[PDB]
Amino acid sequence: NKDVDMLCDTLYQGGNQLLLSDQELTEQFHKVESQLNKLNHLLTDILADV
């Protein structure tokens, strides 16, 4: 029962939804993607101006 308990606690990590991916690594991927999208928007604006 203890084995089941900390296995569930380790896999859930405080979220009701399962967390297969590393959560802070996942939001790191998300912020990298968002900042890359902002840089791409600036770059495409510069491409349109050029």
């Binding site: 590393d22 690594l25 991927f29 993607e33 890359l36 770059l43 050029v50």
Partner: protein, 53 residues
């Protein structure tokens, strides 16, 4: 773990593409800014400003 590894490798491959695209835009604008005539004209501007100053 393999999923996240492939994701980060894709990000590493892709970021350099737009970095080098930024480099292409800068280098191409620099190339089109000064033609063959303009480089020698600006060198003569350097000579003229030096001779005056």
């Amino acid at each position: 773990s393999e999923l996240d590894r492939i994701n980060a490798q894709y990000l590493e491959v892709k970021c350099g593409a737009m970095i080098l695209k930024l480099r292409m835009e800068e280098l191409k604008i620099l190339s089109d800014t000064y033609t063959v005539e303009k480089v020698e004209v600006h060198r003569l501007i350097r000579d003229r400003l030096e001779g005056a100053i």
